[PDB]
Amino acid sequence: EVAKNLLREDLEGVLSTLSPRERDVLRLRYGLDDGRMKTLEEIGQLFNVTRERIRQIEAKALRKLRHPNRNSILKEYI
Amino acid sequence: DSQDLLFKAESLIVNSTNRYHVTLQIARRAKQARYEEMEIKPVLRAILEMSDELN
Amino acid sequence: TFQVECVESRTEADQGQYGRFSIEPLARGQGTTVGNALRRVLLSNLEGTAVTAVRIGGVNHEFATIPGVREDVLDILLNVRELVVHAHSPQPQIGRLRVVGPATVTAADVDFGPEVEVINPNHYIASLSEGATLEMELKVEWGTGYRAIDRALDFLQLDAVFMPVRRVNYSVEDARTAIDRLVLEVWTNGSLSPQEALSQAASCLVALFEPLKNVSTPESQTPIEDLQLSVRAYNCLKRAQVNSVADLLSYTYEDLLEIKNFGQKSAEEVVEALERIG
């Protein structure tokens, strides 16, 4: 259970580096808050802009995380 | 040294008239010590301080 | 002052060696000091040569057997581990043995190089029956005392015992002022003569007590004002809290280039000024 609390923190940290909108998008697209993965369309309605906009945000966030900077600890969690 | 701590411990056990009460005070002090230090080991520093305060 | 003489020297059947030495005159209890220091060093701090590893063709662990070989691998290891050798080169060596057919394999069948020599060519190793081949490769190393395995492929490691001296005894007699005569008896395994183990022990003691015998530029201090730097370069360095030539020497050319508004030409000027002061 202690490698669970620890992990989330590390993830949250790298999430902080991302733009506010970006991180919110990610948290909602993976259910980090509610455990429930949400579609495009729920964020299309809940968020300001509609569908096909959240997909762009998701890719532009992941591309930021995929860099060797701002996310390399989690590589060992795999 | 270890001997020094043992002498200071014995010194505090006397003049207290209650080994339990003085153990509770040492515990509390050491707790505060570590709390306001995380910002030597707590119980040790606590005993050193209390001995040096008994003049 | 005293005179150390060798009184008796023998050689046992296992090629071990015995040597008795008489040392006199010592000074009323110095015999015990000398004798016990010699005994401790002879029994503890002498370098020897021992077989540290062995690879027996056809096996890969200690709990196996070879067809036609009377002894099991573990007994062969326990016999090779007690094989006395003396090396001349300060490197590990590999000795090769290969015996075939009905024979009693002994230490004479081990062929090291021309450097390593077997003290006892009668050490028993194994008994081979008809049609059985025993093939071994031994590795010998230098060391001291008992070395435990630390756990280069397929070589079975041995708990090596580099103990060239097997027994030391001494007795201080009255040689009458009261004077002492030390009698020192050394039994070695034959790797080195008793006289050369006594010599090595004495050398170790002398080197041990030697350290206790008696043990118990103006240009770099120049202030940067004398560097004749440009007023700009000078003011930038002084802004960087650089006050001595030592401080400037604490910076690399890159650190100099990192100085705010310090340019390459000013770093070159500083290099030229330092060359002006050598």
């Binding site: - | 001997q3 043992l6 014995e10 006397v14 339990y20 | -």
Partner: protein
Amino acid sequence: AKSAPIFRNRVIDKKQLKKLIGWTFAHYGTAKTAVVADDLKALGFRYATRAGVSISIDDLKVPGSKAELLESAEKRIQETEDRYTRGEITEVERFQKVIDTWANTNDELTDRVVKNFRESDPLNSVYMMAFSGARGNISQVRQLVGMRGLMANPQGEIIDLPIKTNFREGLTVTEYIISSYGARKGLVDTALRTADSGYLTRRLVDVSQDVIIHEVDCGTSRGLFVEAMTDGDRILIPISQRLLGRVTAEAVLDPSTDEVLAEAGQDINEDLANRIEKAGIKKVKVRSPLTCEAARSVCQKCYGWSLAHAQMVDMGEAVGIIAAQSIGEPGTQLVFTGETARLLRAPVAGTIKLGKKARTRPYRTRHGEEALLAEANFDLVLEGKGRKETFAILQGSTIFVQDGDKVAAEAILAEVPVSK
């Protein structure tokens, strides 16, 4: 502090070390006592190694008079059995006589063993390590260099065949069986005793778990009277050992004058206990958990000291658990007339002057002999050669010598008891 140590210019056994540790604790504290104990441990370990103390077969010295003593005992036994065979004594008197004979032979041999150790070789390793109190006893040196003695059946009956060998000489097959009886008895006792001891400790713990110190004083004037524990003439536990840590419920006074030694409500330390014992008060009224009227517990004044600290008990101390543990810890630590009587032998040769003064009624003793039983305490009068006799009999004594007899050197004269 401030108490300079005394230069102990004497031998140091375990009793002296325990006394020194107690004194050090009383005067210097608990960490100087720890330091002193460590230093003494280091010193003892070093000089027990420099001594080269060892054990050998010749270190087990048997007195050279063992053979003659056994021969004399066997001669007496033969006389007894010849008497039995001729009908002069009955069978339980032959049995009693041979049992008493071998118990006295065992006591004499033990005395000779101790004297031989203390006379020939006082630095013997066995003597040194048994007399100093390190690892040993006297019932074990007896079985190593003396005589094993009379043993018992697996049922309890005393086998009239004694073991007349030590572990140095080596037992026989018969003596090995007789010894194995008791060895197994002890083994089974320990195996079955451990559960009972644990059960007793548990019951004790549950009876007295709620006895915690809650009050300072219940304000009473009741207590019991503490006096020494004596077995009549002899004392078993002195009053000073029984008066340590208690609290006096009334001011004590020296029985010689009007000097007060303690006021009411005062804890007693070792010094005051020794002073009271020295002055012979013989009775002290003290407070106690027996007589304190508190709320379902004892108070601090009625309890007194906590023995682990040499101070008054603290508040909220679970003294019931301590009492239960103290009673239960030694729980797992739980031959005929010998020196419990006293033979009187006159080392003089003279005529008998008993006459008819004391009340001598004819009697048949526990052995086959006939003597005179006396109940009137009377001072023996006998012509002891040069001068008369001043021997004193006791009530119920048994005198063997009657008037008109010739007593010789160390001849048996009487028997005095000490207090179907």
